[PDB]
């Protein structure tokens, strides 16, 4: 097995991909923005907490800090092009609010088409190097019925990094 | 789309699955332990930071706090049974150190068969509800050149939650 010591940022930091990119929707007054975050993870079951790692360079970062509420939405492979688009333009230059969406119970914007989504209340923000982790408490749940709560076979959009997307294979295995 | 408000822990917390389970390797003196963690994510590129979220209930948790160093290793679909096994028994009841493995540059144990692994130095630990986030700085990188392009198409092990695994589909897309 090849190895090297770290001397700075890695030539590629993709060894732990693919991952589901969570689409993070945030609204400040009338302005709605979305951006994908593949750096995301469950953080607690009881109580239910979920985190997104967001660069202070994103227009979304400042919006999270103002609103202190957001959505995290999980989309099917069929929306790879829209997801990539949201991840390739900034709300500083284009109105991503025109992407079809709806407002949740807490007034957070949820991108239409997802198989599931959380409404979150921001609890803490932690700086770790060049991104801040936004830790949200799940206060509502959206679920597209028909897709134990686990998303259906081959449905989930996967991101591999550097503009490359996939989906899970249809076959599953339960040891 | 169905929705409900959260009233406690969710009926299932799998909406954001599947993900890659990181195998978390830890060594304290002579004792070596391994624990899968599907709550994992990148947290910074420069410097390179990687996080794993670990219940205080895992044997591994105490070992991390003593060692303050650890491996995170990423395994091909072929090692699904062994990954699951490491995830369904405790170092309190079996010597998981008998799993074939090697010691890296910093002394952390790395589970053999990985297509990639990181040696990490523990930087910070944060409590979020019922798990602690271990934030490590990547100080060395292992790569199985033959198994990577990232894992090569369909290689990656995916966990969907509650004993159900998969792998990515071979076909990818880059718009
Ligand atoms: C699939 C995908 C995953 C992404 N994940 C993240 C992430 O976890 N963190 C982040 O800061 N940016 C991430 N990005 C970059 C943002 O999505 C991108 O910079 C976006 O255009 C920012 O929009 P904004 O400036 O309107 O907030 C990702 C992009 C893509 C395509
Ligand atoms: C696929 C998979 C992913 C897992 N992810 C996590 C995780 O992110 N956090 C956690 O605390 N436990 C997780 N677990 C549970 C531990 O892997 C499991 O409790 C293991 O028995 C702990 O071993 P230990 O007591 O020796 O540390 C996971 C288990 C499996 C099978
Ligand atoms: O996976 C892609 C990615 C892009 C920007 C980030 O800030 C983090 C991850
Ligand atoms: O997805 C499985 C899982 C198990 C235990 C955890 O603590 C977190 C996730």
GROMACS .gro file of C-alpha atoms and ligand atoms in nm:
model
  430
    1UNK     CA    1   0.000   0.000   0.000
    2UNK     CA    2   0.135   0.346  -0.101
    3UNK     CA    3   0.160   0.603   0.182
    4UNK     CA    4   0.272   0.955   0.232
    5UNK     CA    5   0.281   1.198   0.521
    6UNK     CA    6   0.052   1.503   0.503
    7UNK     CA    7   0.243   1.821   0.421
    8UNK     CA    8  -0.058   2.046   0.382
    9UNK     CA    9  -0.384   2.005   0.195
   10UNK     CA   10  -0.412   1.671   0.019
   11UNK     CA   11  -0.364   1.645  -0.363
   12UNK     CA   12  -0.720   1.501  -0.349
   13UNK     CA   13  -0.937   1.479  -0.031
   14UNK     CA   14  -1.194   1.226  -0.175
   15UNK     CA   15  -1.094   0.898  -0.015
   16UNK     CA   16  -1.412   0.878   0.196
   17UNK     CA   17  -1.655   0.951  -0.098
   18UNK     CA   18  -1.910   0.900  -0.236
   19UNK     CA   19  -2.162   1.069  -0.005
   20UNK     CA   20  -2.516   1.192  -0.026
   21UNK     CA   21  -2.508   1.565  -0.083
   22UNK     CA   22  -2.752   1.737   0.151
   23UNK     CA   23  -2.920   2.035  -0.007
   24UNK     CA   24  -2.918   2.317   0.250
   25UNK     CA   25  -3.208   2.568   0.199
   26UNK     CA   26  -3.216   2.896   0.388
   27UNK     CA   27  -3.440   3.198   0.378
   28UNK     CA   28  -3.380   3.551   0.501
   29UNK     CA   29  -3.691   3.759   0.458
   30UNK     CA   30  -3.787   3.718   0.095
   31UNK     CA   31  -3.448   3.584  -0.023
   32UNK     CA   32  -3.420   3.204  -0.059
   33UNK     CA   33  -3.094   3.023  -0.125
   34UNK     CA   34  -2.989   2.661  -0.166
   35UNK     CA   35  -2.652   2.495  -0.174
   36UNK     CA   36  -2.545   2.129  -0.173
   37UNK     CA   37  -2.321   2.010   0.110
   38UNK     CA   38  -2.157   1.674   0.078
   39UNK     CA   39  -1.984   1.727   0.411
   40UNK     CA   40  -2.275   1.624   0.621
   41UNK     CA   41  -2.348   1.371   0.894
   42UNK     CA   42  -2.583   1.263   1.166
   43UNK     CA   43  -2.454   1.385   1.500
   44UNK     CA   44  -2.706   1.247   1.764
   45UNK     CA   45  -3.020   1.033   1.772
   46UNK     CA   46  -3.168   1.148   2.104
   47UNK     CA   47  -3.205   1.434   2.046
   48UNK     CA   48  -3.193   1.422   1.665
   49UNK     CA   49  -2.903   1.637   1.542
   50UNK     CA   50  -2.760   1.679   1.194
   51UNK     CA   51  -2.462   1.875   1.073
   52UNK     CA   52  -2.351   2.047   0.754
   53UNK     CA   53  -1.994   2.175   0.701
   54UNK     CA   54  -2.012   2.508   0.518
   55UNK     CA   55  -1.724   2.725   0.394
   56UNK     CA   56  -1.735   3.092   0.513
   57UNK     CA   57  -1.688   3.168   0.141
   58UNK     CA   58  -2.048   3.055   0.057
   59UNK     CA   59  -2.328   3.314   0.039
   60UNK     CA   60  -2.523   3.043   0.236
   61UNK     CA   61  -2.288   3.069   0.535
   62UNK     CA   62  -2.394   3.428   0.615
   63UNK     CA   63  -2.757   3.341   0.555
   64UNK     CA   64  -2.745   3.055   0.810
   65UNK     CA   65  -2.601   3.290   1.074
   66UNK     CA   66  -2.882   3.540   1.015
   67UNK     CA   67  -3.178   3.296   0.993
   68UNK     CA   68  -3.057   3.037   1.249
   69UNK     CA   69  -3.292   2.790   1.082
   70UNK     CA   70  -3.252   2.587   0.762
   71UNK     CA   71  -3.358   2.281   0.567
   72UNK     CA   72  -3.155   1.978   0.466
   73UNK     CA   73  -3.313   1.794   0.171
   74UNK     CA   74  -3.212   1.459   0.011
   75UNK     CA   75  -3.274   1.421  -0.364
   76UNK     CA   76  -3.308   1.134  -0.608
   77UNK     CA   77  -3.051   1.059  -0.879
   78UNK     CA   78  -3.298   1.224  -1.130
   79UNK     CA   79  -3.206   1.564  -0.993
   80UNK     CA   80  -2.828   1.544  -1.039
   81UNK     CA   81  -2.826   1.836  -1.289
   82UNK     CA   82  -3.021   2.074  -1.059
   83UNK     CA   83  -2.814   1.976  -0.755
   84UNK     CA   84  -2.491   2.035  -0.949
   85UNK     CA   85  -2.620   2.370  -1.077
   86UNK     CA   86  -2.697   2.483  -0.713
   87UNK     CA   87  -2.349   2.378  -0.624
   88UNK     CA   88  -2.189   2.562  -0.918
   89UNK     CA   89  -2.342   2.909  -0.890
   90UNK     CA   90  -2.363   3.148  -0.595
   91UNK     CA   91  -2.664   3.339  -0.461
   92UNK     CA   92  -2.435   3.646  -0.489
   93UNK     CA   93  -2.489   3.616  -0.869
   94UNK     CA   94  -2.817   3.434  -0.934
   95UNK     CA   95  -3.151   3.400  -0.760
   96UNK     CA   96  -3.166   3.036  -0.657
   97UNK     CA   97  -3.503   3.110  -0.493
   98UNK     CA   98  -3.653   3.055  -0.837
   99UNK     CA   99  -3.564   2.684  -0.807
  100UNK     CA  100  -3.906   2.526  -0.729
  101UNK     CA  101  -3.940   2.498  -0.352
  102UNK     CA  102  -4.180   2.514  -0.068
  103UNK     CA  103  -4.183   2.662   0.279
  104UNK     CA  104  -4.186   2.420   0.573
  105UNK     CA  105  -4.363   2.444   0.907
  106UNK     CA  106  -4.085   2.665   1.049
  107UNK     CA  107  -4.069   2.879   0.728
  108UNK     CA  108  -3.749   2.717   0.598
  109UNK     CA  109  -3.735   2.663   0.217
  110UNK     CA  110  -3.730   2.306   0.099
  111UNK     CA  111  -3.618   2.227  -0.256
  112UNK     CA  112  -3.899   2.045  -0.447
  113UNK     CA  113  -3.843   1.688  -0.562
  114UNK     CA  114  -3.667   1.538  -0.257
  115UNK     CA  115  -3.749   1.199  -0.118
  116UNK     CA  116  -3.697   1.333   0.237
  117UNK     CA  117  -3.600   1.651   0.426
  118UNK     CA  118  -3.539   1.794   0.764
  119UNK     CA  119  -3.635   2.136   0.907
  120UNK     CA  120  -3.366   2.238   1.143
  121UNK     CA  121  -3.311   2.486   1.422
  122UNK     CA  122  -2.940   2.587   1.436
  123UNK     CA  123  -2.794   2.494   1.779
  124UNK     CA  124  -2.415   2.558   1.748
  125UNK     CA  125  -2.150   2.654   1.491
  126UNK     CA  126  -1.798   2.522   1.522
  127UNK     CA  127  -1.495   2.639   1.320
  128UNK     CA  128  -1.271   2.350   1.213
  129UNK     CA  129  -1.002   2.477   0.977
  130UNK     CA  130  -1.154   2.616   0.657
  131UNK     CA  131  -1.520   2.525   0.715
  132UNK     CA  132  -1.768   2.579   0.994
  133UNK     CA  133  -1.989   2.296   1.110
  134UNK     CA  134  -2.348   2.408   1.153
  135UNK     CA  135  -2.516   2.173   1.400
  136UNK     CA  136  -2.897   2.166   1.355
  137UNK     CA  137  -3.173   2.008   1.564
  138UNK     CA  138  -3.431   1.833   1.357
  139UNK     CA  139  -3.770   1.990   1.441
  140UNK     CA  140  -3.968   1.860   1.144
  141UNK     CA  141  -3.945   1.574   0.896
  142UNK     CA  142  -4.071   1.550   0.536
  143UNK     CA  143  -4.096   1.215   0.363
  144UNK     CA  144  -4.208   1.122   0.013
  145UNK     CA  145  -4.409   0.810   0.081
  146UNK     CA  146  -4.309   0.500  -0.110
  147UNK     CA  147  -3.942   0.594  -0.145
  148UNK     CA  148  -3.772   0.130   0.832
  149UNK     CA  149  -3.724   0.487   0.691
  150UNK     CA  150  -3.429   0.399   0.465
  151UNK     CA  151  -3.438   0.558   0.111
  152UNK     CA  152  -3.528   0.303  -0.165
  153UNK     CA  153  -3.293   0.100  -0.388
  154UNK     CA  154  -3.074   0.282  -0.633
  155UNK     CA  155  -3.260   0.610  -0.569
  156UNK     CA  156  -3.011   0.828  -0.377
  157UNK     CA  157  -2.793   1.082  -0.551
  158UNK     CA  158  -2.425   1.022  -0.469
  159UNK     CA  159  -2.141   1.267  -0.518
  160UNK     CA  160  -1.789   1.144  -0.574
  161UNK     CA  161  -1.620   1.484  -0.588
  162UNK     CA  162  -1.497   1.708  -0.868
  163UNK     CA  163  -1.821   1.716  -1.060
  164UNK     CA  164  -1.887   1.342  -1.064
  165UNK     CA  165  -2.216   1.187  -0.955
  166UNK     CA  166  -2.354   0.839  -0.914
  167UNK     CA  167  -2.621   0.634  -0.741
  168UNK     CA  168  -2.623   0.317  -0.538
  169UNK     CA  169  -2.649  -0.017  -0.718
  170UNK     CA  170  -2.985  -0.189  -0.691
  171UNK     CA  171  -2.865  -0.495  -0.500
  172UNK     CA  172  -2.842  -0.487  -0.119
  173UNK     CA  173  -2.700  -0.722   0.141
  174UNK     CA  174  -2.797  -0.785   0.504
  175UNK     CA  175  -2.534  -0.992   0.693
  176UNK     CA  176  -4.518   1.470   0.079
  177UNK     CA  177  -4.588   1.355   0.438
  178UNK     CA  178  -4.452   1.566   0.725
  179UNK     CA  179  -4.446   1.560   1.101
  180UNK     CA  180  -4.295   1.764   1.383
  181UNK     CA  181  -4.028   1.595   1.589
  182UNK     CA  182  -4.137   1.490   1.938
  183UNK     CA  183  -3.824   1.307   2.041
  184UNK     CA  184  -3.602   1.062   1.862
  185UNK     CA  185  -3.714   0.991   1.505
  186UNK     CA  186  -3.882   0.655   1.412
  187UNK     CA  187  -3.585   0.607   1.186
  188UNK     CA  188  -3.296   0.849   1.135
  189UNK     CA  189  -3.184   0.722   0.793
  190UNK     CA  190  -3.312   0.987   0.545
  191UNK     CA  191  -2.956   1.097   0.462
  192UNK     CA  192  -2.822   0.744   0.405
  193UNK     CA  193  -2.645   0.563   0.256
  194UNK     CA  194  -2.294   0.664   0.344
  195UNK     CA  195  -1.946   0.521   0.358
  196UNK     CA  196  -1.864   0.371   0.697
  197UNK     CA  197  -1.523   0.473   0.815
  198UNK     CA  198  -1.344   0.199   1.004
  199UNK     CA  199  -1.197   0.372   1.309
  200UNK     CA  200  -0.876   0.192   1.428
  201UNK     CA  201  -0.736   0.272   1.775
  202UNK     CA  202  -0.443   0.131   1.979
  203UNK     CA  203  -0.369   0.184   2.355
  204UNK     CA  204  -0.044   0.006   2.440
  205UNK     CA  205  -0.092  -0.353   2.326
  206UNK     CA  206  -0.466  -0.342   2.269
  207UNK     CA  207  -0.611  -0.273   1.922
  208UNK     CA  208  -0.975  -0.207   1.847
  209UNK     CA  209  -1.185  -0.138   1.537
  210UNK     CA  210  -1.523   0.026   1.512
  211UNK     CA  211  -1.723   0.128   1.196
  212UNK     CA  212  -1.859   0.483   1.197
  213UNK     CA  213  -2.110   0.584   0.933
  214UNK     CA  214  -2.146   0.926   1.095
  215UNK     CA  215  -1.832   1.060   0.940
  216UNK     CA  216  -1.747   1.357   0.716
  217UNK     CA  217  -1.475   1.583   0.589
  218UNK     CA  218  -1.450   1.903   0.795
  219UNK     CA  219  -1.168   2.110   0.637
  220UNK     CA  220  -0.946   2.084   0.331
  221UNK     CA  221  -0.662   2.316   0.439
  222UNK     CA  222  -0.568   2.182   0.684
  223UNK     CA  223  -0.715   1.842   0.622
  224UNK     CA  224  -0.957   1.749   0.898
  225UNK     CA  225  -1.186   1.452   0.923
  226UNK     CA  226  -1.448   1.379   1.181
  227UNK     CA  227  -1.609   1.072   1.327
  228UNK     CA  228  -1.906   1.075   1.559
  229UNK     CA  229  -1.884   0.808   1.831
  230UNK     CA  230  -2.119   0.719   2.116
  231UNK     CA  231  -1.968   0.731   2.479
  232UNK     CA  232  -2.113   0.375   2.496
  233UNK     CA  233  -1.856   0.230   2.244
  234UNK     CA  234  -1.536   0.071   2.389
  235UNK     CA  235  -1.360   0.271   2.113
  236UNK     CA  236  -1.466   0.604   2.270
  237UNK     CA  237  -1.249   0.567   2.582
  238UNK     CA  238  -0.961   0.436   2.365
  239UNK     CA  239  -0.966   0.748   2.145
  240UNK     CA  240  -0.957   0.979   2.447
  241UNK     CA  241  -0.651   0.794   2.580
  242UNK     CA  242  -0.464   0.753   2.248
  243UNK     CA  243  -0.555   1.091   2.095
  244UNK     CA  244  -0.460   0.928   1.762
  245UNK     CA  245  -0.654   0.699   1.536
  246UNK     CA  246  -0.698   0.553   1.186
  247UNK     CA  247  -0.994   0.597   0.953
  248UNK     CA  248  -0.998   0.330   0.680
  249UNK     CA  249  -1.230   0.286   0.382
  250UNK     CA  250  -1.317  -0.066   0.263
  251UNK     CA  251  -1.433  -0.230  -0.056
  252UNK     CA  252  -1.768  -0.399  -0.083
  253UNK     CA  253  -1.575  -0.731  -0.055
  254UNK     CA  254  -1.521  -0.670   0.315
  255UNK     CA  255  -1.887  -0.612   0.396
  256UNK     CA  256  -1.912  -0.907   0.645
  257UNK     CA  257  -1.595  -0.810   0.835
  258UNK     CA  258  -1.709  -0.445   0.854
  259UNK     CA  259  -2.049  -0.551   0.979
  260UNK     CA  260  -1.892  -0.791   1.231
  261UNK     CA  261  -1.670  -0.511   1.373
  262UNK     CA  262  -1.993  -0.308   1.402
  263UNK     CA  263  -2.198  -0.568   1.591
  264UNK     CA  264  -1.954  -0.675   1.862
  265UNK     CA  265  -1.759  -0.486   2.127
  266UNK     CA  266  -1.391  -0.484   2.230
  267UNK     CA  267  -1.544  -0.538   2.579
  268UNK     CA  268  -1.628  -0.891   2.463
  269UNK     CA  269  -1.384  -0.989   2.180
  270UNK     CA  270  -1.024  -0.897   2.080
  271UNK     CA  271  -1.097  -0.715   1.754
  272UNK     CA  272  -0.719  -0.657   1.734
  273UNK     CA  273  -0.700  -1.001   1.587
  274UNK     CA  274  -0.856  -0.859   1.269
  275UNK     CA  275  -0.565  -0.848   1.017
  276UNK     CA  276  -0.412  -0.506   1.027
  277UNK     CA  277  -0.092  -0.306   1.032
  278UNK     CA  278   0.057  -0.019   1.228
  279UNK     CA  279   0.105   0.310   1.039
  280UNK     CA  280   0.372   0.577   1.065
  281UNK     CA  281   0.226   0.722   1.384
  282UNK     CA  282   0.147   0.382   1.546
  283UNK     CA  283  -0.232   0.373   1.472
  284UNK     CA  284  -0.376   0.043   1.363
  285UNK     CA  285  -0.510   0.022   1.008
  286UNK     CA  286  -0.753  -0.258   0.908
  287UNK     CA  287  -0.602  -0.450   0.618
  288UNK     CA  288  -0.783  -0.460   0.282
  289UNK     CA  289  -0.874  -0.091   0.268
  290UNK     CA  290  -0.862   0.095  -0.063
  291UNK     CA  291  -0.763   0.403   0.142
  292UNK     CA  292  -0.697   0.517   0.504
  293UNK     CA  293  -0.600   0.827   0.702
  294UNK     CA  294  -0.376   0.843   1.010
  295UNK     CA  295  -0.522   1.104   1.231
  296UNK     CA  296  -0.414   1.312   1.524
  297UNK     CA  297  -0.700   1.403   1.748
  298UNK     CA  298  -0.747   1.780   1.763
  299UNK     CA  299  -1.082   1.835   1.940
  300UNK     CA  300  -1.380   1.642   2.072
  301UNK     CA  301  -1.724   1.791   2.076
  302UNK     CA  302  -2.039   1.662   2.246
  303UNK     CA  303  -2.357   1.693   2.041
  304UNK     CA  304  -2.653   1.520   2.216
  305UNK     CA  305  -2.581   1.144   2.252
  306UNK     CA  306  -2.256   1.120   2.045
  307UNK     CA  307  -1.920   1.298   2.055
  308UNK     CA  308  -1.758   1.428   1.737
  309UNK     CA  309  -1.386   1.337   1.721
  310UNK     CA  310  -1.213   1.583   1.493
  311UNK     CA  311  -0.882   1.454   1.361
  312UNK     CA  312  -0.605   1.614   1.155
  313UNK     CA  313  -0.494   1.391   0.873
  314UNK     CA  314  -0.116   1.334   0.919
  315UNK     CA  315  -0.063   1.039   0.684
  316UNK     CA  316  -0.241   0.888   0.385
  317UNK     CA  317  -0.258   0.527   0.269
  318UNK     CA  318  -0.384   0.434  -0.082
  319UNK     CA  319  -0.423   0.100  -0.261
  320UNK     CA  320  -0.323   0.231  -0.604
  321UNK     CA  321  -0.501  -0.052  -0.789
  322UNK     CA  322  -0.835   0.012  -0.620
  323UNK     CA  323  -0.859   0.390  -0.687
  324UNK     CA  324  -0.919   0.626  -0.985
  325UNK     CA  325  -1.154   0.780  -0.496
  326UNK     CA  326  -1.253   0.413  -0.496
  327UNK     CA  327  -1.293   0.291  -0.853
  328UNK     CA  328  -1.652   0.244  -0.978
  329UNK     CA  329  -1.870   0.020  -0.760
  330UNK     CA  330  -1.590  -0.060  -0.512
  331UNK     CA  331  -1.714   0.152  -0.215
  332UNK     CA  332  -1.903  -0.005   0.075
  333UNK     CA  333  -2.232   0.178   0.146
  334UNK     CA  334  -2.436   0.140   0.464
  335UNK     CA  335  -2.808   0.214   0.452
  336UNK     CA  336  -2.868   0.165   0.832
  337UNK     CA  337  -2.997  -0.129   1.042
  338UNK     CA  338  -2.782  -0.406   0.895
  339UNK     CA  339  -2.839  -0.319   0.525
  340UNK     CA  340  -2.541  -0.260   0.291
  341UNK     CA  341  -2.483  -0.174  -0.073
  342UNK     CA  342  -2.233  -0.040  -0.321
  343UNK     CA  343  -2.242   0.231  -0.584
  344UNK     CA  344  -2.365   0.157  -0.935
  345UNK     CA  345  -2.091   0.140  -1.195
  346UNK     CA  346  -2.228   0.424  -1.409
  347UNK     CA  347  -2.129   0.781  -1.320
  348UNK     CA  348  -2.213   1.124  -1.466
  349UNK     CA  349  -2.031   1.455  -1.495
  350UNK     CA  350  -2.240   1.743  -1.643
  351LIG     C1  351  -2.207   1.798  -0.484
  351LIG     C2  352  -2.154   1.918  -0.412
  351LIG     C3  353  -2.127   1.915  -0.274
  351LIG     C4  354  -2.086   2.030  -0.210
  351LIG     N1  355  -2.062   2.028  -0.076
  351LIG     C5  356  -2.021   2.137  -0.011
  351LIG     C6  357  -1.994   2.135   0.135
  351LIG     O1  358  -2.014   2.029   0.206
  351LIG     N2  359  -1.951   2.248   0.190
  351LIG     C7  360  -1.935   2.365   0.122
  351LIG     O2  361  -1.892   2.468   0.184
  351LIG     N3  362  -1.955   2.371  -0.011
  351LIG     C8  363  -1.997   2.263  -0.081
  351LIG     N4  364  -2.017   2.268  -0.218
  351LIG     C9  365  -1.990   2.399  -0.282
  351LIG    C10  366  -2.115   2.480  -0.276
  351LIG     O3  367  -2.225   2.389  -0.300
  351LIG    C11  368  -2.096   2.591  -0.381
  351LIG     O4  369  -1.978   2.664  -0.342
  351LIG    C12  370  -2.223   2.675  -0.397
  351LIG     O5  371  -2.224   2.733  -0.527
  351LIG    C13  372  -2.229   2.790  -0.298
  351LIG     O6  373  -2.346   2.867  -0.316
  351LIG     P1  374  -2.377   3.000  -0.235
  351LIG     O7  375  -2.258   3.093  -0.247
  351LIG     O8  376  -2.508   3.052  -0.292
  351LIG     O9  377  -2.396   2.968  -0.085
  351LIG    C14  378  -2.061   2.154  -0.288
  351LIG    C15  379  -2.087   2.157  -0.425
  351LIG    C16  380  -2.131   2.043  -0.489
  351LIG    C17  381  -2.156   2.044  -0.637
  352LIG     C1  382  -2.206   0.002   0.942
  352LIG     C2  383  -2.198   0.060   1.079
  352LIG     C3  384  -2.181   0.198   1.104
  352LIG     C4  385  -2.173   0.245   1.235
  352LIG     N1  386  -2.155   0.380   1.265
  352LIG     C5  387  -2.145   0.423   1.392
  352LIG     C6  388  -2.122   0.566   1.428
  352LIG     O1  389  -2.114   0.651   1.335
  352LIG     N2  390  -2.117   0.601   1.559
  352LIG     C7  391  -2.123   0.508   1.660
  352LIG     O2  392  -2.116   0.541   1.780
  352LIG     N3  393  -2.139   0.377   1.633
  352LIG     C8  394  -2.152   0.330   1.505
  352LIG     N4  395  -2.170   0.196   1.478
  352LIG     C9  396  -2.177   0.108   1.594
  352LIG    C10  397  -2.042   0.055   1.631
  352LIG     O3  398  -1.971   0.025   1.511
  352LIG    C11  399  -2.069  -0.067   1.719
  352LIG     O4  400  -2.138  -0.031   1.840
  352LIG    C12  401  -1.944  -0.141   1.761
  352LIG     O5  402  -1.987  -0.262   1.826
  352LIG    C13  403  -1.868  -0.067   1.869
  352LIG     O6  404  -1.752  -0.147   1.901
  352LIG     P1  405  -1.675  -0.105   2.036
  352LIG     O7  406  -1.755  -0.121   2.164
  352LIG     O8  407  -1.565  -0.208   2.036
  352LIG     O9  408  -1.620   0.037   2.015
  352LIG    C14  409  -2.183   0.147   1.346
  352LIG    C15  410  -2.198   0.009   1.320
  352LIG    C16  411  -2.209  -0.036   1.190
  352LIG    C17  412  -2.228  -0.184   1.161
  353LIG     O1  413  -1.719   1.749  -0.234
  353LIG     C1  414  -1.701   1.865  -0.268
  353LIG     C2  415  -1.682   1.976  -0.171
  353LIG     C3  416  -1.679   2.104  -0.225
  353LIG     C4  417  -1.665   2.215  -0.141
  353LIG     C5  418  -1.652   2.196  -0.004
  353LIG     O2  419  -1.640   2.306   0.072
  353LIG     C6  420  -1.656   2.068   0.053
  353LIG     C7  421  -1.673   1.957  -0.032
  354LIG     O1  422  -2.598   0.371   1.114
  354LIG     C1  423  -2.569   0.306   1.213
  354LIG     C2  424  -2.524   0.375   1.337
  354LIG     C3  425  -2.508   0.296   1.450
  354LIG     C4  426  -2.471   0.357   1.570
  354LIG     C5  427  -2.448   0.494   1.576
  354LIG     O2  428  -2.411   0.546   1.697
  354LIG     C6  429  -2.464   0.575   1.462
  354LIG     C7  430  -2.502   0.514   1.342
   0.00000   0.00000   0.00000
